[PDB]
Design a protein around this ligand. Sequence first.
Ligand code: VZD
Ligand code: VZD
Ligand code: ZN
Length: 257
Amino acid sequence: HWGYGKHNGPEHWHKDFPIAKGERQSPVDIDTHTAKYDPSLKPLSVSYDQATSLRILNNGHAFNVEFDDSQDKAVLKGGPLDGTYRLIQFHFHWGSLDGQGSEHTVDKKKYAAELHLVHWNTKYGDFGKAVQQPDGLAVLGIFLKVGSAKPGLQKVVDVLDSIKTKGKSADFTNFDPRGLLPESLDYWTYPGSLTTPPLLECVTWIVLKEPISVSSEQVLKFRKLNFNGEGEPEELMVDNWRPAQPLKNRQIKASFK
Ligand SMILES: NS(=O)(=O)c1ccc(NS(=O)(=O)CCNC(=O)Nc2ccc(F)cc2)cc1
Ligand SMILES: NS(=O)(=O)c1ccc(NS(=O)(=O)CCNC(=O)Nc2ccc(F)cc2)cc1
Ligand SMILES: [Zn+2]
């Protein structure tokens, strides 16, 4: 079963998930000199004031903070999107070292980690229906670089020892995801896929240009999580990132000049 290891990592996924070699796979390298400014792109509308986080889960691949998505509470609109997309979860991808960890790259630059805020298009009624549609999901990607601490990340950092191993969950209410955003909402956008199996080609990717800075201690505590379940051989949850995939017949558009 798939993972990031020696024997089951991204280069093996195509054997059980042949769409891994598909036409709109993610992540990709963002070539900043080839991305076209598109003045028809709208500013992003991030409406997280009424977000309801519920819990945090170690699923053996990353840790997900889950939200209540049964009403329009925390929604993403505007930008390249038609309609309203509801936040359902966020999670991160990170490295064993500060020099790697992000999934998207910028002119081949790898960031220390990458945050994915996952939203589904309300016109499809639920997340499981939305992932079967080419405009089903919108994922907001935010790079993390190692620098000053991110105060709004620390509640996430401090709960991690309670979900160290696969299958552990903890209550995680009243978390405000606005504390994870950078100052600017300038972005690049392209059509793509889930970056983990089943790798479905259902995502409008929106990747912010401005990274957030987190402290070395904050990202070190990500690296203390375990891919394995309790009682299984300990394997540190690091380098849970898929490398850049071929861009093929896609254009990356920039919301800014
Ligand atoms: N709003 S809530 O009830 O509290 C709630 C409930 C669950 C979550 N977990 S999740 O975000 O990871 C979505 C996982 N659910 C799926 O259906 N995935 C899937 C993927 C590929 C397929 F092909 C088919 C299904 C978060 C919040
Ligand atoms: N890295 S990314 O592109 O942003 C990305 C990658 C994958 C997802 N999918 S997910 O939200 O569901 C989290 C994964 N967990 C499951 O799918 N669980 C599940 C539960 C019940 C089922 F019936 C089937 C599956 C979202 C964003
Ligand atoms: Zn992700």
